Amino acid sequence: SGFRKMAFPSGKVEGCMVQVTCGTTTLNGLWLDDVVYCPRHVICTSEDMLNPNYEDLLIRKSNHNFLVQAGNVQLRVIGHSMQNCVLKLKVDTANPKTPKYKFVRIQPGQTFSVLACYNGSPSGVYQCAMRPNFTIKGSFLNGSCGSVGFNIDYDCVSFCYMHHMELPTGVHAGTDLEGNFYGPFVDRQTAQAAGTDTTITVNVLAWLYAAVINGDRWFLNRFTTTLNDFNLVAMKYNYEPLTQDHVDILGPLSAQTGIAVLDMCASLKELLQNGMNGRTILGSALLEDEFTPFDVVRQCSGVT
Amino acid sequence: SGFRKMAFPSGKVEGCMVQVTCGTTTLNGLWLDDVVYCPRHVICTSEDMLNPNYEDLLIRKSNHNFLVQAGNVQLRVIGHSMQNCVLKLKVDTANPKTPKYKFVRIQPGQTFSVLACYNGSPSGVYQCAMRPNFTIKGSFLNGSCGSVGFNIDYDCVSFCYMHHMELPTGVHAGTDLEGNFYGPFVDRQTAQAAGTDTTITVNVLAWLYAAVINGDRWFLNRFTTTLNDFNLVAMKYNYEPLTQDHVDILGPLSAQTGIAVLDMCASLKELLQNGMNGRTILGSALLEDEFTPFDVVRQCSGVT
């Protein structure tokens, strides 16, 4: 038993991390097959970032200007192209450590692990959620750009995020591996305010199921509710509306614990209305929303 | 910016995980050089665990009874010995993926990453602290025994923990890599109650410094305190006593923020006495104690 904010093992992704330098800018790249993926803002100076014309800036760059280093060995760049906000640097060597992989665009509320890197070297791994306002709350310093988010299904790594920037509010923004930003954000140093950071309701419920499975039951009450009644309370508390799709997704957790989804919604409703009263749930004093129902099942079953 | 419960990249440790089976028991082992380390309770049946005589049980086991599998390939066991609560299985092949490593016995309050494994395969990685009562609060299911805790200094992996059991209270106990248990626990299915789980005061202060560095400053007050006055409050709240050694260890964080350690102790004192009042610090509603002052410096500087 016990429930932890668990990240995927990062070894498969560590073997893909490289350093990419263009001029005076060094960031991280992802080396998969004979392609290195990195944020296109590697071509920018700090001045350029204020209003960059990436196509115009890219004209002044040749293959030899992109310095790609894997460990202590240099990769030869034989091609470069821009796909949305990412650059794809074709190298002459396929990464021998390339795992089975996919590029996936996640939905808000989904979780992933981030392997934070600096100069192509891994510093740490943590679990994140794509917030409903399309930001992530990570831990990224200067040089962390190009660090990636991913999920693993046994031996296939699904890359879902590449880190690009920190908004003036300290939250993070990035793209999928096709270079498309999550949300309305652009790779420009400009006023970009995030929208409302609502709570991922289906994730909180999944985490409440994880608590029951792991012994924390104090919050279970004698009440039930309806999707409409629950949603009225969820609106008031900046919680995402719960749909029948979410109820169906919670089905296996409901079956395992014997607690109907709407009964758990009524427990969540009372927690929102009365608070925790100085108590904790799974060692947390707030309602945790960065565990999906799939993460809960996976962690509680031991998927390797 | 941003501060996350970050684990070390686990690739170096993933390459050491093997499956060890003895009879009907399968658990994880750590393969370093030509030795596989695993909990000695791999030789036990569920009945034996009630009152095992490990030396007597071990007499009935030969090298061929320990089945060691690395991925899909079997390792030949050419020797076996018991060192405290761990078995050391000598194999005929040195692990080609053996990283630079040390075996270290950590002190209560120190942190480490756990690579949770099942059948020699990694399932996930999370950051833990050795509690002051010598337990850890992990996420371990049946089959997770032999999963290890470690820290990394650039390329050297310091193994500090091997998972052995879950106490009836859901907390976890284990040994260092010499097989010595942390705390008073024994590898026997018996009444083993944990002592008081006090809060790691020096870690909370380090995390309060991390909050200031990352923008969360609401809790800073106009007060100061003394080590003795602070410790009176810390005793009342089941916080570990703060020593001058702890103040010295917080020195670089104090210097970076310009907030004297005793002033931060006065902030912590008011937080203990008044609570958070429904507010959060680094996205937490409670005082976090599983970040050491070294973790805070490391995360805030970007050590790879």
Ligand SMILES: O=C(Nc1nncn1C1CC1)[C@H]1CCOc2ccc(Cl)cc21
């Ligand atoms: O935000 C940035 N990258 C990063 N990633 N995670 C965190 N941080 C930094 C620490 C903010 C870059 C990309 C956008 O253009 C600029 C412009 C100025 C500066 Cl200082 C940084 C950046």
Ligand SMILES: O=C(Nc1nncn1C1CC1)[C@H]1CCOc2ccc(Cl)cc21
């Ligand atoms: O606690 C155990 N290992 C484990 N590790 N982390 C978690 N869990 C299990 C889930 C409790 C083992 C070792 C002690 O002897 C026994 C005896 C009975 C049983 Cl059921 C398990 C065990």
